[PDB]
Amino acid sequence: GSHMHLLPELASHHAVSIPELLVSRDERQARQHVWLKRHPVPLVSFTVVAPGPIKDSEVTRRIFNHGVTALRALAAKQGWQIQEQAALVSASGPEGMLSIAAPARDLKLATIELEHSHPLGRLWDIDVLTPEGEILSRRDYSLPPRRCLLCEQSAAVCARGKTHQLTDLLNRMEALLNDVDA
Ligand SMILES: [Zn+2]
């Protein structure tokens, strides 16, 4: 476990290379599996939308810190115990892990609702893994796919189609943060 709030002014602004990000996804899967073996309960694996090479910034830390607060409030409201929790900075930027003694399907459904209904939920990537390592998905419940941050089409096809400009994604992140932290 660790403290989970990341001081925004201490952002590293680490520049992530393409192979560094590719390696990190295998490291993240291994780290997830360690947590599932230490505490055999569902795991929340939380990252923030962080486009471009610099993923640990004052903006992404501020977004992340709101998400930590919301996830802790979700667990308390649903009556689920957090058995362990930690935050780190990876090649994906701020990253949170929470082992939660909840039913895995209930937890994923709750985080889907959080991503939809919190004003900053569009900027959160909240994964939920079962103790067998299954990554749960909106598709498992026949729910519509996650929408693109900037339009009504699915985020997957706008990402694959490189539809939107990096600057426009970053500027929307700033604008949403300013809208909540007036
Ligand atoms: Zn789009």
Automatic annotation (TrEMBL):
Coiled coil: none annotated. Pfam families: CitX. Its EC number is 2.7.7.61. Keywords: Lyase, Nucleotidyltransferase, Transferase. One of its GO terms (molecular function) is lyase activity. InterPro entries: CitX (IPR005551). GO terms for biological process: prosthetic group biosynthetic process. It catalyses: apo-[citrate lyase ACP] + 2'-(5''-triphospho-alpha-D-ribosyl)-3'-dephospho-CoA = holo-[citrate lyase ACP] + diphosphate. Belongs to the CitX family. HAMAP family: CitX. Transfers 2-(5''-triphosphoribosyl)-3'-dephosphocoenzyme-A on a serine residue to the apo-acyl carrier protein (gamma chain) of the citrate lyase to yield holo-acyl carrier protein. This is Probable apo-citrate lyase phosphoribosyl-dephospho-CoA transferase. It comes from Escherichia coli.
